[PDB]
Design a protein around this nucleic acid. Structure first.
Length: 1974
RNA sequence: ACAC
RNA sequence: ACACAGAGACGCCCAG
RNA sequence: CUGGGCGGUCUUUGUGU
RNA sequence: AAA
């Protein structure tokens, strides 16, 4: 009954003892069984245990009666669970805790019992049970459970000083207890009786990576959704339809007939809508289309004018801020004027209070008018110790009335006649005939781009000084020219206006939180400008009101145009009426100057204008810049809809014959109330563009392979421009703020959208998944079509994947669900607390609903005893089923698209939904054409398609594309259909749970905002015009009946649709099924169509969720063939919209069908080879910051936003200008225009430039966004006093400098930045403290983390560690702190007035300021006077080698001397890889620390290498100790959390940047030909020269003897350093070993090769046969072995491959001494060489240790690989076909290569060729001057080429020129050279009854016929296969090619290249040009 | 940051 | 002034 | 009909990459 | 030369 008694029943002796197995047998005459009940429901297994029968031996004492609960997850092991429910420990312990770590790979195997016996000894007891009625099973179990632990315990006890260790395996069964301990027979009999009870319970109830599989399998097998309850609970939830759909086939007659009907309907609509028979011509068809567009537009205009307020002339500005540009100056308060404060009284109410304020200020105090610079100096110097000016004016009644009209004090004057009049008139729509000429005149003529002549001003001087201090790192003239361009942009008329507007908004944001008494006003002066603002602050949520007053003798300049609102004139002064802004609108105002700078820079770069040249602006720049200015200032949600729709509108001109552009479709969304002038102007321009593009398609102009579109134009302005400018002009509206506050008068559109499809729900359920339908109405579908689509996708997946795909999918989903934890849930996402309580209004009117985070629910679940995710599914399901509904809350996120309808989710619903989401995500990852779970397929389907069509069809193939969308993708997908498709794509076990989960979605009670219901219930009268408002009001008040109400409740019921987002993969899988069925149908129709001649074609489908693209390519043979094929493909693509309603899709009207060489899948516009992605969208989002605890993380986020701009296609100069704008934004949020003490902070920053102290690191101009914050930090450390400060800090960390208390930056953030500066306070911790004390976490988590540092690298063992990790995640600097947020930027910028001088920055107890911290560091960093040694740097910056390599390339390109050249059409997305993980480290720091402290195999180094890496890490930190506890006491930290953060934060990361440009060391090409569009930058060691030589040495026309001779010469002449100790496949070590083999300046060559490879010396003694996969890549299949020497042993590893898998095999060894190091090294080697371990070895004979999953197998158990124990003068150089193999010529039959070297195309540089050419009298290639032009990149002119041709002749031989090599070398090189400028082409039964409009001839009249237009394929795959040749970037004979072209005209050999004829006799003129080929 |  | 094919906000709580 | 002090105030951000 |  107690473990300690039987534990102490043993004797203690030296060494491990396995005991003696004692056989037991029952003798006590067990009477029978107690009361046993099985009640397995979904919530668990409740077993009722009665009183045991009375026994003669009185057994069953500890089986006392009661109720015991067993979870369904832990039901696969119930016999063992209940057998030992007694003496089992109430804790769990790992072997690494009680025993020293040996790194043997079996130290994580936790046993059942680890008992620290009371004699200071250790014992282990392992339970076991066998279900066999004999002793043989007992013996087998005893043997297995003794071999599982006999050896590792011996390994750990050899080290242990006291070997007092005993092993305690008990083999319990039905018959006997085989044990090596002396057991009391009563206790043994009791345990046997418990096992018998558990066995009978298992019978009556059943009716590391393997445990999760078993748990999930047992749960899903035993889980029982109450379907009988479910049907009565949720509608349409019967399993009968599901099993019928699974059972019955698809009726082929129904599918056939429906296909015929839909196809003829599509044909009829195409004929009658796109202007077909009676036969017309394209001109008159376009004229009729234009007339139809005119008719529809005038109908819309009439329908909008009918609902307007007439009033053709109306006055209100579109930018409600005054147009004045004042000259900045020093801070001063001048009040008195010439006329005095007596003329201001007689000018109105505004003048009255503007005189009152000035009278109060002048005859009073100026405190609060401006922030004093002295009052805060005393509080900045000091330690541990906002004041707005307030005045109440006279306020006559008329003035109060006028203020109440404009919003000020406007609530008490609510029922006045004038106020009610204004309220009546404010709800009146305007008219599209508004006569808007002010805006049109403004966007042609405006002074915005004129310079303001304001170069020297205080804000400009401060920003310029900061810019120069940033630029101090890079003094190149390139940087100065870009900085002068930025200064010139900064001096413009519009940015000098936006600077004071941003200052005004920054002052207003801080003033917003302040509150005033009734009648009070606040007067403020802008910092640098003589502008006075009177501020009336309401509640912070409410609007804040401002009036602006200026001297009017200081208004030096005014922005031109009538768009700005009018200003009251007070005589001397200019005043403006009070205007209103709230928090959301403020974001655009603060960010206006950066926005305008990014816009002028973007458009200047777009229009070919370089930054360095200064020119008069053109018209188009004014248009775009003014439009951005206007739309940014107005910030209204209706305005940006028009431009986003003009995107779709101008996507119609790419539609080709036989269809006409039909843009008028978009008018169904343009019908919306227009309440401003800019909206009317946008509507008018949009309709004019609509008419223009309806009257004429965008012309396609074929060229010599190139295809272009012409006639493209701006939507909102007349000017015609390039296609890129139009595509980027579409996105302009994105400048408007994405997040805007939703008022209570809104959200009615949301409820209208939700319930719109609810009314149209069908009542007969026969068509909702039961029967087959033709033309369903709004929600129905046909199960035959659904089954056909899912069967087609099943066939496609089974073709793509293996035939066992379902079994592996089941294993995948079970492993995913089983490994899920509760802690992996939560993640601080909002949930819904809607329950039965809230469902009754006026019960809940008193209390206020609050949404809560999932973290609290997960805390309650953790305290509930639930640890895995699968243990809480049953309780959540029961809670849902006991409620009969799922509860959903609502929020209105605003998206740059239309609008979002976000549905929040209840915690239990989320728990149930997560499982089916994972189940659908796995099958989506198995799909071959989806993108959401397969990110790869997005760029590998639309780009492979050109290559695939090239193979399948042939050269000169015409492509047709479609772009399909969905307009009602959220509501319309009836849950039955999703459940049917999903259950079709699953095994049978999952089907029940899946169906039950989807059945929950049938009823979705959604909470309506209680504040909205407060005013809905208070007004029983409906009034209004929109019928939905009246419907909801009547339904609530009950004088109407709708399904979606229940007579006075707070929930709107809903039966249809899948809520937006919560199902993201089931509907994606459905859409993939639809796309696959469409592809199959298209293939079937293409194989037989148009009279039966098979139109050769390929169709490739791609889909996400709603956006999809169908692409069909064809290759015709004649004009009639071309036109008929194009018409047939057009019909196939047009039938999609008609076939779609058979599924629940409902094709959108924003789709684009029948486009030739254009496709827009996911906003990536592929216009033939040109790939266009808008950069304006990411340039607009450049300056949206996130809240930061530290200060360097803000700059890191800025860097991420800049890098995203770089991905968008922005030029490097543009990227640098955007970062210059970001600098200004960072300093403005820091306080550059609010805090008086900023100047002192600026001076402090100049002396000490430090990241995380407010200094901004500026990137190099040539490479701007490619390199993250780490590279900038490294460069500044190399070349500033930041190196001194970092060295000081790392001396504090190393411990050689005390520097106690303040300083000691012992904490680091992401991106390798360490600082002790953090503003934890962040405007207090009320919400944080509420979250902390609401959850029952232990507030002493650091004390248990210190004593148990194990849980920082392990997933989960027990609940206490789960609670510790939860407490860690609830105190993380980012995960919990950042998540709480509203509008981030105003909240941040409001802190700019106290951040600089107040106590906010904690020392990472007391708080201080930025100034205080800088003054404290002013006596530390300067005083330190050190530097960074290379070890210190190479652990502060592990990637330093790549950093200096990149910096060398960047340093080379500085000079601004270059040529504008011709632009490149091809334009693709290359992935240049930079800053790869360095190889000379062998591991990372955190995983190495985990290996040393706990023995977790995260690194792949073993005991010797582990010890070496630990030795150098000790060299880094002398107080690092193996034992984790001794490290915390010595090391300068506070807890293992701080140590873990510090270790993990500074590391090497695999940086990768994608780009957009010409296809492609490779960094230099991007540096040159990406700086500006159409401008090469034209910039003017030892191993680079060696690489450049050896590339053409191995790849060249030379002879093998001459090859190796010049190899030896090149190795001897150059100087190569000694090799290093790398861990992976490197080439520098191979070059060094190759050099040292010949120089012989070291030891034995084999030893150096062995140690260079970290102890590995071997190769493929028996290689494997090579097969070429489609793309090259010779793969290794067959039988082969690998022989070498690992760790002073002899290995013969055998490899076997059959397909794309290279699973390993029998591992032959030579001794058992160092198996573990051999295993680690062999794993490393197999990872580098591409050898996995999945297939178990076929061998099953004699073996000792198996190998499966690259893990140690303790036993032969789980059969794997049979690991069997059982001349430095013959080496040479093979040189045998461009591989420099060395070989050992090991025992006869094998050659055993040891080193390889493959010269690639990258290793070519300009300098090396010139230096070799000059040093021609230094090597052996100086002779044969026709050669060494193959080694050095030369240009062979007429005489040199004549010399080469004379040398060639027919057949001549030289020393090493060989024969038949010059032929193919010249062929490849010069065919590629001729391909550069052109010349040689690159890589060369629903029938329509044959009716015909005019035999499809007049339909295509005047068309650019394309089947003879030599058009090329498009796709990054086709630009790579053209560059796949090893000789592309060579200029061997290019002048020869241009002279050939000049000789033979443009045509010349166009014949001979195509068909052999030029004039049949040319001979001596161009004979060598033909000798080159034939 | 994007897409629902 | 914001929001709106008229729902709201234009300050909230307490004391007299 | 006048005064006062409070207030990341309130939740405002779901699902996946 | 295997991604």
């Amino acid at each position: 009954m107690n473990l300690e008694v039987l534990c102490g029943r043993i004797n203690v002796e030296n060494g491990l003892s396995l005991g003696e197995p004692g056989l037991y047998d029952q003798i006590y005459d067990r009477p029978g069984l107690p009361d046993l009940d099985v009640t397995v429901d979904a919530t668990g297994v409740t077993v009722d245990i009665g009183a045991v029968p009375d026994s003669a031996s009185q057994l069953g004492s500890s089986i006392n009666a009661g109720l015991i609960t067993i979870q369904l997850s832990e039901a696969y092991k119930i016999n063992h669970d209940f057998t030992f429910s007694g003496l089992s420990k109430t804790t769990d312990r790992r072997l690494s805790e009680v025993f020293p770590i040996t790194h043997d790979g079996s130290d994580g195997m936790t046993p059942a019992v680890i008992h620290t016996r009371l004699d200071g000894t250790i014992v282990v007891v392992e339970f076991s049970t066998t279900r066999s009625h004999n002793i043989g099973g007992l013996e087998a179990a005893y043997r297995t459970k003794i071999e599982k632990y006999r050896d590792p315990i011996s390994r750990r006890v050899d080290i242990m000083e006291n070997p007092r260790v005993f092993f305690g395996v008990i083999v319990v069964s039905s018959g006997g207890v085989l044990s090596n301990m002396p057991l009391t027979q009563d206790e043994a009999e009791e345990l046997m009786y418990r096992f018998c009870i558990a066995n009978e319970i298992y019978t009556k109830a059943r009716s590391e990576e393997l445990e999760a599989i078993s748990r999930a399998l047992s749960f899903f097998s035993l889980f029982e959704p109450n379907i009988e309850r479910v049907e009565g609970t949720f509608p349409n939830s019967e399993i009968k339809m599901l099993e019928q759909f699974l059972s019955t086939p698809a009726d082929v007659d129904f599918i056939t007939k429906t296909l015929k009907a839909k196809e003829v309907e599509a044909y009829a609509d195409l004929c009658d809508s796109h202007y077909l028979k009676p036969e017309k011509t394209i001109q008159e068809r376009l004229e009729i289309n234009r007339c139809e567009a005119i008719d529809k537009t005038q109908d819309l205009l009439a329908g909008l004018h009918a609902r307007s307020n007439k009033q053709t002339s109306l006055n209100r500005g579109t930018v409600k801020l005054p147009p004045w540009l004042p000259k900045p100056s020093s801070e001063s308060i001048d009040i008195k004027t010439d006329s005095g404060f007596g003329s201001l009284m007689d000018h109105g109410a505004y003048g009255e209070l503007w005189a009152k304020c000035l009278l109060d200020v002048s005859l009073g105090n100026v405190e609060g008018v401006v922030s004093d610079p002295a009052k805060e100096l005393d509080i900045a110097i000091s330690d541990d110790p906002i004041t707005y000016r307030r005045f109440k004016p006279a306020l006559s009644s008329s003035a109060r009335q006028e203020f109440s009209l404009q919003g000020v004090e406007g609530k008490k004057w609510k029922r006045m006649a004038a106020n009610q009049k204004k309220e009546k008139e404010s709800h009146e729509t305007l008219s599209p005939f508004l006569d808007v000429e002010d805006i049109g005149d403004f966007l042609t003529f405006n002074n915005l781009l004129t310079d303001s002549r304001y170069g020297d001003e205080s804000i400009q001087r401060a920003v310029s000084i900061l810019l120069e201090k940033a630029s101090a790192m890079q003094d190149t003239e390139l940087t100065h020219a870009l900085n002068d361009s930025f200064k010139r942009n900064l001096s413009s008329n519009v940015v000098q206006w936006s600077l004071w507007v941003s200052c005004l908004a920054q002052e207003l944001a801080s003033a917003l939180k302040q509150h005033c008494r009734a009648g009070e006003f606040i007067i403020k002066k802008l910092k640098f400008w003589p502008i006075y603002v009177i501020i009336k602050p309401t509640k912070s949520s409410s609007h804040i009101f401002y009036s602006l007053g200026i001297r009017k003798a200081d208004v030096t300049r005014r922005l031109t145009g009538r768009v700005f609102s009018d200003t009251i004139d007070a005589g001397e002064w200019e005043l403006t009426e009070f205007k209103s802004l709230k928090t959301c609108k403020l974001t655009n105002l603060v960010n206006l100057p950066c926005t305008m700078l990014n816009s002028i820079a973007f458009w200047r770069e777009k229009l070919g204008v370089a930054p360095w040249l200064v020119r008069k602006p053109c018209s188009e720049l004014r248009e775009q810049v003014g439009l951005t200015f206007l739309i940014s200032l107005e910030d209204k949600s209706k305005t940006e809809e028009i431009i986003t729709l003009t995107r779709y509108t101008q996507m119609e001109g790419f539609v080709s014959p036989p269809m006409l552009p039909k843009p008028q479709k978009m008018l169904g969304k343009l019908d919306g109330p227009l309440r401003t002038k800019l909206q009317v102007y946008l509507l008018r321009k949009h309709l004019d563009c609509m008419v223009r593009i309806a009257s004429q398609p965008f012309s396609l102009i074929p060229r010599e392979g190139r295809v272009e579109w012409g006639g493209t134009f701006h939507a909102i302005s007349g000017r015609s421009t390039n296609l890129e400018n139009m595509v980027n002009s579409w996105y302009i509206g994105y400048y408007k703020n994405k997040e805007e506050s939703t008022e209570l008068n809104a959200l009615g559109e949301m409820y209208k959208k939700i319930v719109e499809m609810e009314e149209d729900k069908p009542s007969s359920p026969e068509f909702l998944g039961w029967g087959d339908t033709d033309s369903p109405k709004k929600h129905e579908f046909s199960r035959s079509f659904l089954r056909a689509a899912c069967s087609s996708l099943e066939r496609e997946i089974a073709q793509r994947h293996g035939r066992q795909w379902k079994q592996n999918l089941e294993e995948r989903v079970l492993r995913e669900i089983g490994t899920k934890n509760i802690l992996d849930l939560a993640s601080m996402k909002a949930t819904s607390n809607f329950s039965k309580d809230w469902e009754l209004y006026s019960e809940v009117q008193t209390k206020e609903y609050h949404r809560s985070k999932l973290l609290e629910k997960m805390a309650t679940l953790i305290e509930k005893g639930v640890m895995w995710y699968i243990d809480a599914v049953g309780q959540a399901w029961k809670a849902v089923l006991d409620d009969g509904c799922m509860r959903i809350c609502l929020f209105k996120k605003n998206q740059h698209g239309g609008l979002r309808e976000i549905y929040v989710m209840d915690a239990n619903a989320r728990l149930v939904q997560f499982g089916v989401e994972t189940m659908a995500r796995c099958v989506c990852e198995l799909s071959p054409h989806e993108t959401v779970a397969n990110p790869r397929l997005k760029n590998s389907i639309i780009e492979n398609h050109g290559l695939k069509s090239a193979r399948s069809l042939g050269p000169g193939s015409i492509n047709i594309n479609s772009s399909n969308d969905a307009k009602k993708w959220n509501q319309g997908h009836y849950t039955t259909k999703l459940a049917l498709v999903l259950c079709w794509f699953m095994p049978a076990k999952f089907h029940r749970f899946i169906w039950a989960a989807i059945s929950m979605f049938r009823r979705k009670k959604m909470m309506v905002d209680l504040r909205f219901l407060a005013h809905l219930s208070s007004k029983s009268e409906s009034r209004s015009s929109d019928p939905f408002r009246e419907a909801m009001t009547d339904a609530f008040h009950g004088n109407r009946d709708v399904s979606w109400m229940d007579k006075g409740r707070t929930y709107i019921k809903t039966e249809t649709g899948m809520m937006q987002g919560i199902l993201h993969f089931t509907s994606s899988l459905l859409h993939s099924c639809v796309q696959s069925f469409y592809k199959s149908y298209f293939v079937s129709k293409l194989k037989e169509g148009y009279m039966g001649e098979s139109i050769s074609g390929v169709v490739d489908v791609i889909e996400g969720s709603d956006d999809s693209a169908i692409m069909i390519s064809i290759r015709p043979k004649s004009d009639m063939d071309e036109v008929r094929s194009r018409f047939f493909v057009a019909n196939l693509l047009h039938s999609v919209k008609f076939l779609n309603p058979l599924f629940g899709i409902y094709s959108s009207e924003k789709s684009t069908v029948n486009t030739v060489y254009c496709v827009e899948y996911n906003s990536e516009f592929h216009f033939h080879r040109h790939l266009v992605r808008p950069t304006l969208r990411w340039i607009a989002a450049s300056h949206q910051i996130s809240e930061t605890e530290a200060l360097a993380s803000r700059q890191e986020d800025y860097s991420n936003l800049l890098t995203q701009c770089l991905e968008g296609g922005a030029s490097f100069s543009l990227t640098y200008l955007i970062q210059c704008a970001q600098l200004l934004h960072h300093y403005m949020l820091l306080g550059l225009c609010l805090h008086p003490l900023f100047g002192t902070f600026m001076g402090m920053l100049i002396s000490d430039p430090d990241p995380a102290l407010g200094f901004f690191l500026m990137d190099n101009p040539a490479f701007a966004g490619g390199a993250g914050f780490r590279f900038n930090l490294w460069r500044a450390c190399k070349t500033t006093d930041l190196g001194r400060k970092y060295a000081y800090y790392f001396n504090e960390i190393q411990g050689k400098t005390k520097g106690d208390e303040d300083y000691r930056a012992l904490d680091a953030t992401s991106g390798g930045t360490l600082s002790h500066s953090v503003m934890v306070y962040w405007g207090d911790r009320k919400k944080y403290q509420a979250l902390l004390n609401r959850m029952g976490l232990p507030e002493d988590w650091v004390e248990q983390i210190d004593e148990n540092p194990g849980v920082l690298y392990r997933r989960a063992a027990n609940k206490k560690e789960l609670l510790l990790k939860l407490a860690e995640k609830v105190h993380s600097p980012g995960v919990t702190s950042s998540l709480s947020k509203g509008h981030v930027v105003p909240r941040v910028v409001a802190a700019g007035v106290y951040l600089l001088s107040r106590h906010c920055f904690r020392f990472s107890t007391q708080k201080a300021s930025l100034i205080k911290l800088l003054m404290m560091s002013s006596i530390s960093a300067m005083k330190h006077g050190g530097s960074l040694n290379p070890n210190q740097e190479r652990m502060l910056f592990p990637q330093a080698q790549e950093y200096d390599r990149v910096c060398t390339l960047l340093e080379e390109v500085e000079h601004l001397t270059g040529k504008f050249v011709v632009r490149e059409r091809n334009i693709v997305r290359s992935r240049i890889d930079l800053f790869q993980e360095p190889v000379d480290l062998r591991c990372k720091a955190e995983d190495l620390v985990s290996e040393v402290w706990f023995g977790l195999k995260r690194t792949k180094l073993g005991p010797r290498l582990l010890k070496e890496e630990w030795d150098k890490l000790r060299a880094s930190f002398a107080w690092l100790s193996t034992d984790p506890s001794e490290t915390l006491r010595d090391g300068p930290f506070l807890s293992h959390v701080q140590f873990r953060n510090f270790i993990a934060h500074v590391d090497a990361k695999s940086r990768s940047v994608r780009l957009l440009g010409a296809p492609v060391t490779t960094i230099s090409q991007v540096v040159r030909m990406n700086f500006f569009p159409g401008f090469s930058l034209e910039a003017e060691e030892s191993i680079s020269i060696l690489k450049h030589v050896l590339f053409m040495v191995l790849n060249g026309p030379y002879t093998e003897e001459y090859k190796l001779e010049m190899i030896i010469e090149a190795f001897s002449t150059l100087v190569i350093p000694q090799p290093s100790e790398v861990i992976r496949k490197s080439r520098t070590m191979t070059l060094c070993l190759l050099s040292n083999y010949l120089s012989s300046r070291g030891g034995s060559i084999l030893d150096q090769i062995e140690r260079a490879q970290s102890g590995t010396l071997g190769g493929f003694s028996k290689p494997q046969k090579t097969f070429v996969r489609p793309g090259g890549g010779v793969g290794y299949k067959g039988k082969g072995v690998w022989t070498g020497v690992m760790e002073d042993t002899h290995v013969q590893i055998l490899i076997d491959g059959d397909g794309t898998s290279n699973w390993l095999e029998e591992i032959r060894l030579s001794s058992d001494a160092r198996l573990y190091d051999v295993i680690e090294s062999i794993r490393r080697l197999c990872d580098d060489l591409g050898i996995n371990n999945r297939v178990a070895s076929a061998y099953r004979g004699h073996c000792m240790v198996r190998l499966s999953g690259f893990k140690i197998k303790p036993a032969s158990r789980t059969d794997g690989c049979p690991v069997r124990i059982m001349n430095p003068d013959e080496v040479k150089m093979r040189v045998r076909g461009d591989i420099l193999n060395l070989s050992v010529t090991i025992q006869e039959g094998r050659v055993m290569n040891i080193l390889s070297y493959r010269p690639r195309d990258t290793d070519i540089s300009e300098s090396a060729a010139a230096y070799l050419w000059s040093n021609r009298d230094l090597f052996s290639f100086g002779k044969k001057e026709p050669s060494c032009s193959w080694i050095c990149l030369k240009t062979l002119d007429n005489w040199a080429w004549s010399h080469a041709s004379v040398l060639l002749a027919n057949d001549r031989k030289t020393q090493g020129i060989d024969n038949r090599a010059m032929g193919n070398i010249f062929r490849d090189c010069l065919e590629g050279s001729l391909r550069k400028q052109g010349l040689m082409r690159s890589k060369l039964i629903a029938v329509e009854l044959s009716e015909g409009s005019l035999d499809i001839e007049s339909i295509f009249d005047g068309a650019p016929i394309l089947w003879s237009a030599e058009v090329e394929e498009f796709g990054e795959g086709v630009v790579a296969v053209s560059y796949s040749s090893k000789y592309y970037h060579l200029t061997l004979m290019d002048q020869a090619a241009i002279t050939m072209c000049a000789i033979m005209g443009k045509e010349g050999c166009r014949g001979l290249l195509t068909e052999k004829r030029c004039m049949a006799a040319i001979r001596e003129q161009v004979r060598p040009f033909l000798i080159f080929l034939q």
